[PDB]
Amino acid sequence: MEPDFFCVKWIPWKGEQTPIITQSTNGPCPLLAIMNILFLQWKVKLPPQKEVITSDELMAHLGNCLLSIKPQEGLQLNFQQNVDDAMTVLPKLATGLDVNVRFTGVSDFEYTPECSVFDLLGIPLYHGWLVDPQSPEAVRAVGKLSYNQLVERIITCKHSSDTNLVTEGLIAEQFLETTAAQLTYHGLCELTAAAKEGELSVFFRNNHFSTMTKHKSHLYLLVTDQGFLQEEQVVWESLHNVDGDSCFCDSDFHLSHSL
């Protein structure tokens, strides 16, 4: 109930009573997105008694998990740096992380130190925010620029003497006005296609981090919402429609219905 305390839903996962962390805040900290993936993979175990958990608790669990990862062609020297780099930006996942997306593919983002937690834990970060290839106008306008970059450029555009840069200026502005809930249809398709069937990942949209997976060839996000705390029958929520209706499922990915 209080601000760095979170509630522990217990749910029958791959045979066993498994914990999962619920947030009503729906913030921009990835800790739960990552942590939930870990509890699901059973890399972290909570005593069954357990009801609430602190940030500081999760944070410990995560640090020991990272320092516990056995090395394995991969990065050689780049591994050991990767660990130290993870360790040095580890205390920032608490306070939550700004992500600068690229519109160019579901896996592309401007690299930041926080990306090392994900990269090391074998967790992919994906996003849905892709510029469609049906509008060659806008693909070229936005181009290979980053988001925080696009806004910089849009502004230096409104002020250019070349009118063509105010054309691109207004095109790029347009795409952001239109695609502002940050999942294009194109995004969804590409991202559906792209995730490994079965594998747990982290889905970014509207400064929010979610735990994702692919199943029977569609996407589902784990239900961190706290309202559905009592309801174990409620775990996954479909991500089939870009904007529309969700069908809640039990851990076995079959339909469930709330009290």
Residue numbers in the entry: 109 to 180, 184 to 370
Source paper text:
MINDY1 and MINDY2 are members of the MINDY family of deubiquitinases (DUBs) that have exquisite specificity for cleaving K48-polyUb, yet we have a poor understanding of their catalytic mechanism. Here, we analyze the crystal structures of MINDY1 and MINDY2 alone and in complex with monoUb, di-, and penta-K48-polyUb, identifying 5 distinct Ub binding sites in the catalytic domain that explain how these DUBs sense both Ub chain length and linkage type to cleave K48-polyUb chains. We also find that MINDY1/2 use a non-canonical catalytic triad composed of Cys-His-Thr.
In the autoinhibited state of MINDY1, sulfur-centered hydrogen bonding of the catalytic C137 with the hydroxyl of Y114 rotates C137 away from the active site. In the active conformation, this inhibitory Y114-C137 interaction is broken due to the Cys loop movement, and the side chain of Y114 now hydrogen bonds with S163. Interestingly, in the MINDY1∼Ub complex, which represents the product-bound intermediate state, Y114 is hydrogen bonded to S163 before the transition back from the activated to the inhibited state after Ub chain hydrolysis. These observations strongly imply a linchpin role for Y114 in regulating the transition from an inhibited to active state. Hydrogen bonding of C137 to Y114 is broken in the mutant. In MINDY1 and MINDY2, an additional layer of regulation is imparted by a sulfur-centered hydrogen bond between a Tyr and the catalytic Cys, which further reinforces autoinhibition.
